[PDB]
RNA sequence: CGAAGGUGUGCUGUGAGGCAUGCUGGAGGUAUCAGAAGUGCGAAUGCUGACAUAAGUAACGAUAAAGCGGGUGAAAAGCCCGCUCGCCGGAAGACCAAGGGUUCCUGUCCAACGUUAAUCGGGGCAGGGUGAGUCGACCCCUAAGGCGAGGCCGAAAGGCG
RNA sequence: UAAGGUGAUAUGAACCGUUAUAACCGGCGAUUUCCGAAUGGGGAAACCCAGUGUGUUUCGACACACUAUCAUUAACUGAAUCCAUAGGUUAAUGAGGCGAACCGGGGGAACUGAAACAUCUAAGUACCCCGAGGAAAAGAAAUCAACCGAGAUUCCCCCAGUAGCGGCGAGCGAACGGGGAGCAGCCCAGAGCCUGAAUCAGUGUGUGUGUUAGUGGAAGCGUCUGGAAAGGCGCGCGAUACAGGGUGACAGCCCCGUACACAAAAAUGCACAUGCUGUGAGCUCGAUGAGUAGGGCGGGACACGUGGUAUCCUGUCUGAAUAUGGGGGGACCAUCCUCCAAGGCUAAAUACUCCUGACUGACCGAUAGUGAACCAGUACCGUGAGGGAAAGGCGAAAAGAAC
Ligand SMILES: [Mg+2]
Ligand SMILES: [Mg+2]
Ligand SMILES: [Mg+2]
Ligand SMILES: [Mg+2]
Ligand SMILES: [Mg+2]
Ligand SMILES: [Mg+2]
Ligand SMILES: [Mg+2]
Ligand SMILES: [Mg+2]
Ligand SMILES: [Mg+2]
Ligand SMILES: [Mg+2]
Ligand SMILES: [Mg+2]
Ligand SMILES: [Mg+2]
Ligand SMILES: [Mg+2]
Ligand SMILES: [Mg+2]
Ligand SMILES: [Mg+2]
Ligand SMILES: [Mg+2]
Ligand SMILES: [Mg+2]
Ligand SMILES: [Mg+2]
Ligand SMILES: [Mg+2]
Ligand SMILES: [Mg+2]
């Protein structure tokens with residue numbers, strides 16, 4: 001049947017994108033933790 | 047549209063292929079690799095000064111580089127810009 | 140915010156204690172009022188967010204003295 | 217600061233060719249040398265059609281640890297050891313056994 | 319080089335820079351059409367250009 | 381002139397064990413007396429890996445359906461060519477968007493992938509291929525809603541505008 | 542510094558270099574796209590679109606520079622409203638973001654313990670937030686003592702699981718005094734006189750000395766086994782060097798080192814010296830921190846849970862004296878002793894480790910030790926926060942097996 005993941009790049013980027021992380025104090029902490037963990041991909045990008 | 051330092055950097059290489067050979071025989075059009083950030087105007091000027099022939103029109107596309115896997119890892123070739131540069135009827139080279 | 144521009148009085152925290160001595164966290168707010176002071180030396184009214192305590196400071200020192208403290212503090216009015 | 221150098225005549229101290237002498241043909245960053253006529257191997261070289269090259273058993277000098285050779289002091293007939301000193305304003309090599317510059 | 323260069327004017331070094339960028343264009347086309355036997359030339363030209371631009375810069379800077 | 385470990389054997393200890401030695405192995409081992417413990421495993425529906433069992437069993441994914449001649453090939457029910465047969469046909473055709481991202485075309489190869497074989501493939505490798513003033517985006521314009529100089533508000537963080 | 546080189550898988554190609562512009566090492570420079578605080582505006586990061594000024598042997602658009610916000614300052618402007626003030630533009634200077642732990646502060650849990658549970662505990666812990674420094678904070682008595690005296694702060698050892706607090710339960714838990722580390726004392730609340738007089742900081746120069754490259758660095762040969770000798774055996778030698786590593790088996794004497802002795806054109810640390818802009822020295826006569834201390838109410842902090850409860854902070858209401866004065870000495874009073882609040886600064890002993898160098902381990906040795914010995918915060922999973930592996934060993938040498 002119909003499953004839970006229905007893609008939309010526009011909505012992907014608006015919810016989870018780099019600029020959205022940067023817009024709030026807590027999203028900027030998501031990036032900090034990820035960079036400290038040494039993640040290759042901070043967010044899903046182009 | 048030009049400054050010579052930039053014009054000299056804009057054309058990278060002839061591109062060879064059946065499509066490109068035919069485009070020359072059939073349409074007096076030469077196919078090139080040009081700088082990624084090159085514009086049709088630059089390409090036109092560049093071709094006209096360096097290869098010293100008159101240009102009719104330039105068409106351009108951007109080629110996506112193919113990806114190749116390698117066990118668990120991928121490699122990616124570079125995108126580049128292709129230019130279809132049509133010479134005027136009095137054909138040269 | 141709930142802050143006296145004269146004394147710095149601001150919310151502080153503490154407990155409600157019941158008869159059975161249950162502590163629940165609470166605040167104590169300052170007794171603030173926006174009030175218009177006539178400043179003679181500037182032919183003008185100045186509105187300060189002041190605790191009542193702060194008002195008594197202004198009765199004692201004079202508004203000129205207290206506004207001078209505001210400047211030196213960098214605080215604008 | 218290198219004690220053994222290209223074109224030196226050296227004598228082998230260690231290995232199957234102990235005792236033989238030969239000219240250093242090149243020294244490798246790995247601390248190994250190729251000495252003429254020393255430490256030969258008979259490799260089975262695969263054919264390569266690019267050039268229509270057939271295969272063959274080839275004899276080549278294989279690389280030998282440089283610490284397995286000594287500088288040869290032709291003037292005394294023996295293995296020797298290098299040291300450094302300054303003559304004129306330039307650094308030189310000299311044989312330990314007889315204090316002579318190389 | 320780098321001294322032969324340092325003893326030219328700004329006028330001359332711009333001329334030489336053009337000359338090198340032209341040579342560089344021609345080598346590129348040769349290599350790209352599998353006609354360059356001497357692959358090593360590219361790096362010498364590339365680096366000459368650097369040297370020349372590095373000197374223009376040091377002459378302007380003071 | 382063969383260490384540790386592995387595998388046999390002989391002797392010995394009440395036992396946990398010990399010593400000797402054949403074979404394997406190929407560079408380490410360690411008496412004695414002391415010293416310190418990540419010190420002993422069959423169980424915890426323990427943890428990780430490896431390998432059994434059921435068993436060459438069930439199954440091979442819509443009951444739209446196949447038959448033959450020729451070809452390629454080491455091999456052809458399945459790939460190519462041909463003649464027939466059957467199925468869909470408000471779709472099982474064609475074209476957009478979203479989403480994917482080279483899967484497209486050609487050559488070449490078949491281990492693994494493909495629920496079988498595979499010469500074939502959306503599989504491997506290489507090369508090629510996407511051409512715009514007027515098709516779309518960008519662009520100009522706004523909707524819900526978002527952000528928001530100053531500003532209002534809030535222990536701080538911030539909320540609202 | 543050099544006779545070898547153009548980083549790795551990783552060959553090959555074309556080349557560079559050998560006595561000094563090959564390469565390599567270190568100091569100082571140059572260049573340093575785009576995104577990112579991101580700062581010309583916008584935005585779904587690495588993209589879209591501008592304004593103004595400059596440039597066109599072609600003066601097209603393309604190129605180059607500037608243009609974010611906030612704060613302090615200045616100049617020019619400028620309302621309601623006469624002056625003024627707000628406002629407005631421009632310029633100068635600064636900030637912004639990131640990041641280990643330690644550090645000061647604003648907020649502040651619960652499971653749990655009490656063999657249930659609410660006072661109490663956990664605990665001012667976890668967490669969130671703000672800010673700073675190489676340390677932070679604290680600090681030169683309105684402090685203790687006890688009629689003898691001590692003499693700021695911080696840290697360590699005792700005092701002591703004591704005195705106490707406590708549904709006097711569970712628990713919580715001092716200080717006096719003693720031994721130590723370290724030690725350092727100043728300024729304003731003001732005018733005169735003498736006047737740049739001690740001090741600090743920014744900073745030029747000097748010497749000294751560290752750091753960032755480096756330089757020299759002793760002494761073994763025969764024989765046996767073996768594929769190979771560092772092993773056995775023989776006889777030598779160095780040692781302020783027998784720390785360690787490598788080399789075809791275990792090497793003081795083969796190689797790199799090690800003991801010891803040395804070295805910097807350049808940048809930088811720290812130190813004495815010195816120039817500089819600024820800061821003010823000592824002297825006399827002054828002055829002496831008020832919405833404060835105290836108090837009523839509610840809370841909080843003190844080991845101290847309101848108790849007979851001193852001391853501290855203060856949300857709220859009040860409110861002194863002025864050295865002939867005031868605080869404290871654990872309710873309170875007298876006596877006596879002691880100190881001087883309502884202004885500020887201050888090094889050391891103390892806390893820590895993202896990082897750099899050197900050295901060490903009765904620490905691990907591939908299911909261990911990091912999650913990761915290996916291209917791992919990867920592959921993979923998840924919309925996302927987030928979660929998160931497996932996986933080392935031919936040989937001495939590829940001699941990696943021609944035919
Ligand atoms: Mg196009
Ligand atoms: Mg063992
Ligand atoms: Mg044993
Ligand atoms: Mg024992
Ligand atoms: Mg058991
Ligand atoms: Mg059965
Ligand atoms: Mg059956
Ligand atoms: Mg069946
Ligand atoms: Mg089927
Ligand atoms: Mg088969
Ligand atoms: Mg593919
Ligand atoms: Mg295809
Ligand atoms: Mg198959
Ligand atoms: Mg394919
Ligand atoms: Mg056209
Ligand atoms: Mg808003
Ligand atoms: Mg704002
Ligand atoms: Mg921008
Ligand atoms: Mg716009
Ligand atoms: Mg922006």
Ligand SMILES: [Mg+2]
Nearest residue numbers: 620622623624
């Ligand atoms: Mg007016």
Ligand SMILES: [Mg+2]
Nearest residue numbers: 636637638639
């Ligand atoms: Mg900051």
Ligand SMILES: [Mg+2]
Nearest residue numbers: 653654655657
């Ligand atoms: Mg309980």
Ligand SMILES: [Mg+2]
Nearest residue numbers: 640673674675
């Ligand atoms: Mg700092």
Ligand SMILES: [Mg+2]
Nearest residue numbers: 677678679887
């Ligand atoms: Mg301090």
Ligand SMILES: [Mg+2]
Nearest residue numbers: 688690878879
């Ligand atoms: Mg006394």
Ligand SMILES: [Mg+2]
Nearest residue numbers: 702713714844
């Ligand atoms: Mg304690």
Ligand SMILES: [Mg+2]
Nearest residue numbers: 718719720721
């Ligand atoms: Mg003491």
Ligand SMILES: [Mg+2]
Nearest residue numbers: 721722723724
């Ligand atoms: Mg002392």
Ligand SMILES: [Mg+2]
Nearest residue numbers: 299758759798
């Ligand atoms: Mg030596």
Ligand SMILES: [Mg+2]
Nearest residue numbers: 406407789790
């Ligand atoms: Mg061996």
Ligand SMILES: [Mg+2]
Nearest residue numbers: 829830881882
């Ligand atoms: Mg006083």
Ligand SMILES: [Mg+2]
Nearest residue numbers: 834853868882
């Ligand atoms: Mg008091």
Ligand SMILES: [Mg+2]
Nearest residue numbers: 847848849850
């Ligand atoms: Mg009582």
Ligand SMILES: [Mg+2]
Nearest residue numbers: 830882884885
């Ligand atoms: Mg004071």
Ligand SMILES: [Mg+2]
Nearest residue numbers: 894896897898
């Ligand atoms: Mg370290």
